[PDB]
């Protein structure tokens, strides 16, 4: 992550490293306590299959309650709900009944499964199957079920895949209307979200200096929706060093404003982990985008004294 | 939901109710199998207690992929990522001291411990540790980890929260100025996610008459950010039945976007069941909102045989 | 297919169901048999070994092959070629060292190893790693790896995204200016794949009558790239039935070239499974996408006397 | 390949070397272990046919799933779809004869016969008979089951084919009505599949002069389809250091296009492959080609510091 220090890169193969090395260690202890194989492979089947019964019996737990949203959630199919709750019916049918199989076979099978009801029973009942936060957030970042993804697909494909290609346009018409502001769009991403509507309170330095002209389009049926863009001078040292077109990201602030209320149920650290994750995606659509041929320049920091002009300065400069 | 019969209501305690029974019958069974309770004790307790064991070996294996992202998911406390990979550490801590005090002490150990460890290495490399879809969904909606839960929050504060006020004012300027424009702003919400830029185009019977007194605002560093609305005809057999300011829902274009996008990684069937969502929490967050005094009338409905301007109609008959 | 009967529909779980009916009927077999249970995990056991550690031997024996294209098909990365060779390396790696570790331990290893390494060998050598027919379509058809695909997805975003979108336009134009043409581009899908450049030699009936004003655009460094589109007049039993823009599905003849030529490597059989495949493509791509909003009519027909025109005016007239 | 060092050169025969060596040294330890030759004879023959039985139980549970598209992919003739399961059906069952034969009477059967199909139901059910991406892309490239071999041979059949005959006479044309463009078609072949529809955003040193005179002809029912070729300056210091004819090959753009489509299944890891399987496809059928009389010149380029007029310039002064 190039853009700020503090981004999370994506998780990579960590732990299936530490399983194979886990495995590994178990083999050696297996081939050093020198039991009989057979034993090993007996009970490790057994397991496994324990394993199966108990995912048989929560799916049928789960789908006590899923069968309630058949007609609006799967669409009035219950093979549908079943699948959602037992994972593909077809395997899960023919592991259980190897497990079944097993169980019954190898060195009393209704007494052990009465004793497996009720534990997946307990596990249900004391909410007990709730997955660490780690894994939450693996599952969640792997299949996108975070905020941050769609506020950051939002922020691209209904602001920035509009703005972007026709920016030169606009910006050549300022500048032979009247002062040579940067063909870009300087976004800023406080990583605290701390988002005031006027740049000038956010640092002295900051100065308006004018709009750009509008842009105008139909959206959604409103028509005649208008894009504005100001313009602001970064003031150094009394002098004038540079001008751009300066904006925070605006799904930040309702970030910030998700965290402040109740009803949201957001937290505010999760206030930080989604606004780095909306930086970390904001980067790879502007990255794998056509319309960002060199047209944005996205700034992220971090409050700790702190300039933002300084920091628009130096990325302007270079 | 009064919405829309397809939108799903939140889970329940269907699961809870279910595993109830399944205890129930499990205690039922086990009295009439009339074994020795002391021995049923004993399994279960050490049942429980592989599951203990099976939760630390995974936990570490999670923590060797964790410990990565230390200084930058963590904030470089490894305390922090101890509890993200196993809970809370002193709970987990007595579990585990229970578990191995039990397993060592009730009628080998090493041998046991090599086989569960082989166990999560093996459910770990083999990539079984997935969740139903319907547990993932209930997580989700739980932990609010949707992407229509922060373009529902995005909508709210940025667009309602910001012109619903102002819209009897700019209602009444229109009134005195010419026409009577019902008092309220209707928003569609087509669940399958269609939102064309122009209703004409939807609907030949819905008809524009012009916009309203636009609305200008400061907003994340962008000076005299404007909001317009756009008023437009209901026909009926080519007369003007009704007029209303009427307006599409805009992150549905933002669904529709993000599942038409490889890289988004958002599905279809994952863009109904978000578009849906979306049309709850907007409906929740309305309902327990001071702004909506009354100014706003969500519409939701699904194609088919229908047309639109007639559902308007029937919205505004009320 | 509303297309045509004989598109072939895409492939369902058949298989899965015929396995778990084999499953359940080898399970009831072996219970019939009454042998040991032991024995019978234990030759299982052994048997998915011995298939891991010919899996193994074949991924060295392409490692061999692959080590050349290193740095051209796998940006010079070891570790990208081996995972291209044994898939997952982790997951490889750890069955192997079970299957390793349960082949020596239950009930010669050197001399079984030998022997399977000189079955690999043989199999590789005499070129027995042909998969069937059935087998080679499935995995294309499931991964997209047809001409078909290709060419539904050059003929989409190449022609129609380009042309259904404007259409309307360009009728009406030629209708004020002059004979009710419909408002719909008729694409005729010839599954036979004879495509012949004057559709008055493909039936008399078809009549032409005038041209639609051109459309005009830039295009990969050719601008002014012009899109035209003839109007035919379905000429019945003597009288005008109706006219329309008519037209051929030009991928066709790309593909019956092909079809023709030696070093393309292309037979008939594969040219009549690919067209079916294009018809089938096409269908959903248009199907799902937003421009063909009741712009085109897809019309797929196969030659048995018969008349283009009569199918045509079916079409039209419904 | 000439065109560029990142195009793969074909499969060569390095698989099947490795092979004999590994079928060498099998022999050579078979020899050391000194033991009797007959039992290695029996175990080898018992391990090809538990292996031709698999392959019989695996093509009966293909052949359930293709038996239901029977009519539209196998023209209802049953031998067809069993020939598409079961490799050659007379092969099969003379080995499947042969094997059974020596599996009953070499020193249970049907037993081993349950084993083996509980093994086959499984691989099938847990899904794997998944093939390495080496394999598969092995399997495609030979077959030729690319995308971009339909694309490449579309490309050459219906414009170059068409095209490049003429390109002397309308360059002459131009030549005598003013301008010194060189005798060629230049085709960039960009790796990456950028293709911009203008060259001059692609590189500022490249400027348009004019266009060629138009060609026209009838291709599928449309008639007057005019292909037109722009030509263009190559500048140096900004003076014109040379004239041709330039383009993108615009299949390129369907490529890029399609992995940007979530619907097309397409990678972008994919995208490279393809591109470079293109330009090799593009380059072979072009030197085996009678049109091609030096009248084109293929250049490709990756990006990097790279400017894409100094690229055709040297291409041009050879
Ligand atoms: N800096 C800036 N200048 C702009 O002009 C602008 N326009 C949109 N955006 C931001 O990009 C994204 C695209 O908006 P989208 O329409 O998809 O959702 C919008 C849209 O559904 C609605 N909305 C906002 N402004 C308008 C508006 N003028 N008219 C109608 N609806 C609006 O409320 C949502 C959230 O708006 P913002 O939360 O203030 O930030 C948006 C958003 O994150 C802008 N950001
Ligand atoms: N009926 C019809 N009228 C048209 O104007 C038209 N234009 C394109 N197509 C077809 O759509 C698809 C997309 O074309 P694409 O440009 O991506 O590949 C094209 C393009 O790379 C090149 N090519 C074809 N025509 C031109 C042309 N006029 N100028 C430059 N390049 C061309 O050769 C490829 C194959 O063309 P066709 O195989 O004859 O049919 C095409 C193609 O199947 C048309 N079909
Ligand atoms: C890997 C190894 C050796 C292991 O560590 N355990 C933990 C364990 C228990 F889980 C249960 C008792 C002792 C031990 Cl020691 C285990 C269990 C089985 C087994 O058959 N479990 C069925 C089963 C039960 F026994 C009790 C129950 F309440 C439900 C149930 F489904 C096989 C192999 C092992
Ligand atoms: C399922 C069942 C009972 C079965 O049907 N076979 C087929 C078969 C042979 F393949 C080989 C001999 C007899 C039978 Cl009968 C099998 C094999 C093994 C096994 O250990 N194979 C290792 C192995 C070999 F034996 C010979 C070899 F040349 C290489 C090699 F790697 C275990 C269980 C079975
Ligand atoms: C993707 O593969 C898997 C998927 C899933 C899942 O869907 O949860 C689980 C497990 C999967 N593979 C691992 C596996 C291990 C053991 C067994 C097996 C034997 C086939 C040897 C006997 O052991 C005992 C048994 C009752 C567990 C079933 O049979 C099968 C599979
Ligand atoms: C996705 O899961 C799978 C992937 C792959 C693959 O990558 O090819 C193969 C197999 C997979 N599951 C099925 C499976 C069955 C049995 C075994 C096992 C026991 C775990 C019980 C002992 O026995 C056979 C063994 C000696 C090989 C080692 O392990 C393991 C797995």
Redesign the pocket.
Known sequence: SSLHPSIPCPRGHGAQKAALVLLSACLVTLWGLGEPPEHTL??????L??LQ??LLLNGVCSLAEELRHIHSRYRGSYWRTVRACLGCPLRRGALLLLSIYF?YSLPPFTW??A??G??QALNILLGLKGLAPAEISAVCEKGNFNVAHGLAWSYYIGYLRLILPELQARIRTYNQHYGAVSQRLYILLPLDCGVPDNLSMADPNIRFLDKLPQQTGDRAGIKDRVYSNSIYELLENGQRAGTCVLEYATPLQTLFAMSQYSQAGFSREDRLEQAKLFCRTLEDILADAPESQNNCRLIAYQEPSFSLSQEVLRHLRQ
Not at 42 to 47: G, T
């Open positions: 007996r009970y490790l089947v057994l397991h299959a324990s019964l108990g169980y052990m499964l004793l497996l009720l534990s």
